[PDB]
Every structure is written in structure tokens, then in C-alpha cells.
């Protein structure tokens, strides 16, 4: 059996990026799906460290927290910079991605109707830092940090993909980010995964909003 | 090194990394940014995500409090003994960060109306860290493994500020209580925590705690 198991709801959500990472890196894993019904029964939830999913298994190592899973795979698969300095820049990018993801999640689940207009208006100011990072790294022609892909690339890519669904054309103001999405999305193993039923037939979020 | 931390005159998101630096016998410079200086706008516009802290390690400039913690963790060897422990360290820190975010939201956006529900929910939010301790050397060492990690400093801060918010919140948790006492007694950290540099800063920037 595969050494990796992803335990999650039937959504892309906070597992989209780590799945893209595993697929693009040619790693095999198992998906264990948790229905809302099973979740509401409460026993799985009570057994989760912080009462939430995803849960991730790497052999007998059990992890929670999506960014913990990303960093773990980043370490073990060599997607965490070429040295200690790059590692810090990778973290700086991912923490930035996480900050915006939290705001996105808040909009989706708690304030979509009333909050969307304001959110989209504020969105360019939130995306600009990643354009800036790209512009300062080899003219934005490679990756978000250095000249090799990192776990932060997969997370940023997901963030950008879901925001294009939320606010179509939001990357028209950001040529480097736009080219970056096209470029990474064209990586053969990743392109195949993104096109597959395994990815396409899951909703982005759990409440039907996107 | 050398280290410079750039921040408002509060403990806030720099409390943990300061405890780390002090406990680890590191030297650093504080560049205090006043609210008036911040409102001028130029510094803010120059920050990657428009926020402090900003951190300098020689010619390396960092933003994001947890990036700074992880950087110090990796460079000073406060990140567990191997990859499996490093993952556990991240799991703790991400958990600490999740509760810190909830704390910050309470303090700055909903203190008066929201404190009652927050404090009622607090035991269930703290229990995971007690459980983690219980599963590591009976809670007698650190939150992960047998050596201190950056997650310890972050968790310690989280616990200290919650004792201020909700006195007695650790009384039902013997391992966390003993852990706070034990880490706080570490000589360099004890001296730092007792110093005006720590004591005479407010925890947050809006006078609430
Ligand atoms: N900080 C956590 C947050 C995880 C989280 O919010 N999980 C949600 C779904 S994405 C969940 O389990 N909701 C059910 C519940 O909280 O009871 C992470 O990064 O994984
Ligand atoms: N995720 C960031 C959040 C940083 C943050 O929230 N900084 C606040 C003070 S703690 C700030 O700069 N406020 C002023 C502003 O946003 O303009 C981190 O961990 O450092
Ligand atoms: Ca100074
Ligand atoms: Ca050590
Ligand atoms: Pt969040
Ligand atoms: Pt937050
Ligand atoms: Pt948050």
C-alpha cells in the first residue's frame, strides 16, 4: 500500500496544494474520504489533535495542519530551498499564502454575500506581494523562490487558481503571476492531475460557494 | 547575526522570538516603530505584506513572525532531532498559531461581546497541548522531543497571555502548568521575563489583555 494517506472531506480545500505536490512529484497516496455525516457523528473529530481535518499519515507518523503536511513533504522530497536562506524565503511565501487563504476561507464560509465586493476590491493589494517576489527572482521566469520548485509554489498556485474562479481576470493586473500559473499548470504530471476526475469532480469548498 | 527586530512597542507577535533569542543567549537590536511613525505610511509600504515584524539577520530581511521563528529554529538547532520531530514541531506551532489568531481576533475586533464565549471554549483549545505533553516523556521535557524548539517558546507565550486573559485557565492541566513553571525558570529566560524590557511592554496594542 502507499505510505501516504490523506484523510479529508470530499473537497479540494486545504488539501488541494499538497495533492498537487504529490502528483507533480510522482508520489502515490491513498484518499480516505470523510462524509459530513461521519464527521457529525463526532468520534473521528474527537480523535483529531485539534478537532479538524486534514489528517495525514506517512507510515505511522500522523500529522494534522495542512501547512505542517506541506512542510513535511517539502523536507522529505527536497522542495524546501537549496539552503537555509532559501528555506526562510519559502516559509515567508507560504505564511503569506496562508494569510490570504484565511481571508478567502472567511469570505467563503461566513460572509460571501455581503463581503465579496469589498474582498475583490482589496484583492489586487493582496496579490501584489507575490508579483513583487516573482519580479525579484530571475524576472519571474522560474519559481517563487530560487530556481527549483518548493512546497510554497504548489500552495501559491492553488491560491491563484481559486481566486481566478472567485474573481475572473484578477491576474490580468499581474503578468508574472499569470504566466506563472500557466507555466506550472503545464508541468506534465500536474497538468494530468488537474484535468483528472480525481481533482475536477471535487468542489473547491464544502458549502457550494466559490 | 547580527539580529534586528523591527516592531511596535508591544509584546504581541514578537514575544516568542524574543524569549527564544534571550534564552539562547543571542544578542539583538530593537527598532521600535511608534504608531505615529507607522501612520506616516512609508515604512508600511516598504514591508512585503504591509506589516511588522520585520527581521534582519545580517543581509537577510524577513517578514512573518512564524517565518522568523522557523528561521531561528533551523539556524540555531531548535527544530527537533530529525525530520519526523520537525514535522511534530510544525504541527505544534501551527496549532499555537491557530489559537493565537483567535486570541488576536478577540482582543482587537470583539473583546467586550466575545470574551465570555472565548473563555468558555478555552479549555477545549488548550487540552491538545496537555495531551501532546502527556505523550512525550510524561510531559517532563519539551513539547516535542528531548530538546527545546521554537514551538516551545511560541506555546509558552500563548499560555502566559491566556493566563492573563483567563486567570486559572491552566489549573486543570498539570503538565502545562508544570511546563510553564519549568521553562520560565530557565535562567536566561527567567531574567528576560523579569526585565523591564518585557514587563513594561503591553501584551497588545489596544490596551486590552
Ligand atoms: N489550521 C488548520 C485548519 C483546518 C480546518 O479548518 N479544517 C476544517 C475543514 S478545511 C474542518 O475540519 N472543519 C470541521 C470542524 O472544524 O469541525 C489547517 O491548516 O489544517
Ligand atoms: N502573519 C503576520 C501578521 C503580522 C501582523 O498582523 N502585524 C500587525 C501587528 S502584530 C501589523 O503590522 N499591524 C499594522 C498594519 O497592518 O498596518 C505575522 O505572523 O507576522
Ligand atoms: Ca533601538
Ligand atoms: Ca538543539
Ligand atoms: Pt484560518
Ligand atoms: Pt490571524
Ligand atoms: Pt486566521
Curated annotation (Swiss-Prot), chain A:
Conjugation of reduced glutathione to a wide number of exogenous and endogenous hydrophobic electrophiles. Involved in the formation of glutathione conjugates of both prostaglandin A2 (PGA2) and prostaglandin J2 (PGJ2). Participates in the formation of novel hepoxilin regioisomers. Negatively regulates CDK5 activity via p25/p35 translocation to prevent neurodegeneration. Homodimer. Interacts with CDK5. It comes from the Eukaryota. Residues 2-81 form the GST N-terminal domain. Belongs to the GST superfamily. Pi family. This is Glutathione S-transferase P. Its EC number is 2.5.1.18. The modification N6-acetyllysine is found at residue 128. Its main location: cytoplasm. GO terms for molecular function: dinitrosyl-iron complex binding; fatty acid binding; glutathione peroxidase activity; glutathione transferase activity; JUN kinase binding; nitric oxide binding; protein serine/threonine kinase inhibitor activity; S-nitrosoglutathione binding. It is found in: Cytoplasm; Mitochondrion; Nucleus. Keywords: Acetylation, Cytoplasm, Lipid metabolism, Mitochondrion, Nucleus, Phosphoprotein, Transferase. The gene is GSTP1.
Curated annotation (Swiss-Prot), chain B:
Glutathione binds at residues 7, 13, 38, 44, 51-52, 64-65. It is found in: Cytoplasm; Mitochondrion; Nucleus. The modification N6-succinyllysine is found at residues 102, 115. GO terms for cellular component: cytoplasm; cytosol; extracellular exosome; extracellular region; extracellular space; ficolin-1-rich granule lumen; mitochondrion; nucleus. Its EC number is 2.5.1.18. It catalyses: RX + glutathione = an S-substituted glutathione + a halide anion + H(+); prostaglandin J2 + glutathione = prostaglandin J2-S-(R)-glutathione; prostaglandin J2 + glutathione = prostaglandin J2-S-(S)-glutathione; prostaglandin A2 + glutathione = prostaglandin A2-S-(S)-glutathione. Changing residue 7 to F: Reduces catalytic activity about 50-fold. Gene3D superfamilies: 1.20.1050.10, Glutaredoxin (3.40.30.10). The modification Phosphothreonine is found at residue 61. The modification N6-acetyllysine is found at residue 127. InterPro entries: Glutathione-S-Trfase_C-like, Glutathione-S-Trfase_C_sf, Glutathione_S-Trfase, Glutathione_S-Trfase_N, GST_C, GST_pi, GST_superfamily, Thioredoxin-like_sf. GO terms for molecular function: dinitrosyl-iron complex binding; fatty acid binding; glutathione peroxidase activity; glutathione transferase activity; JUN kinase binding; nitric oxide binding; protein serine/threonine kinase inhibitor activity; S-nitrosoglutathione binding. The modification Phosphotyrosine is found at residues 3, 198. Residues 82-203 form the GST C-terminal domain. One of its GO terms (biological process) is prostaglandin metabolic process. The keyword Thylakoid does not apply. Keywords: Acetylation, Cytoplasm, Lipid metabolism, Mitochondrion, Nucleus, Phosphoprotein, Transferase. Conjugation of reduced glutathione to a wide number of exogenous and endogenous hydrophobic electrophiles. Involved in the formation of glutathione conjugates of both prostaglandin A2 (PGA2) and prostaglandin J2 (PGJ2). Participates in the formation of novel hepoxilin regioisomers. Negatively regulates CDK5 activity via p25/p35 translocation to prevent neurodegeneration. Belongs to the GST superfamily. Pi family. This is Glutathione S-transferase P. It comes from Homo sapiens (Human). The lineage of its organism: Eukaryota, Metazoa, Chordata, Craniata, Vertebrata.
Amino acid at each position: 500500500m502507499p505510505p501516504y494517506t490523506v484523510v479529508y472531506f470530499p473537497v479540494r480545500g486545504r488539501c488541494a496544494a499538497l495533492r498537487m505536490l504529490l502528483a507533480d512529484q510522482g508520489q502515490s497516496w491513498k484518499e480516505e474520504v470523510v462524509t459530513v455525516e461521519t464527521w457529525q457523528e463526532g468520534s473521528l473529530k474527537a480523535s483529531c489533535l485539534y478537532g479538524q481535518l486534514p489528517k495525514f499519515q506517512d507510515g505511522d507518523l500522523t500529522l494534522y495542519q495542512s501547512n505542517t503536511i506541506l512542510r513535511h513533504l517539502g523536507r522529505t522530497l527536497g522542495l524546501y530551498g537549496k539552503d537555509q536562506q532559501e528555506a526562510a524565503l519559502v516559509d515567508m511565501v507560504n505564511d503569506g499564502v496562508e494569510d490570504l487563504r484565511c481571508k478567502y476561507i472567511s469570505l467563503i464560509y461566513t460572509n460571501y454575500e455581503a463581503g465579496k465586493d469589498d474582498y475583490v476590491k482589496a484583492l489586487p493589494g493582496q496579490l501584489k506581494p507575490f508579483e513583487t517576489l516573482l519580479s525579484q527572482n530571475q524576472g519571474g521566469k522560474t519559481f517563487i523562490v530560487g530556481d527549483q520548485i518548493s512546497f510554497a509554489d504548489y500552495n501559491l498556485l492553488d491560491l491563484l487558481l481559486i481566486h481566478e474562479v472567485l474573481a475572473p481576470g484578477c491576474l490580468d493586473a499581474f503578468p508574472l503571476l499569470s504566466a506563472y500559473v500557466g507555466r506550472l499548470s503545464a508541468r506534465p504530471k500536474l497538468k494530468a492531475f488537474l484535468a483528472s476526475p480525481e481533482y475536477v469532480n471535487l468542489p473547491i469548498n464544502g458549502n457550494g460557494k466559490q
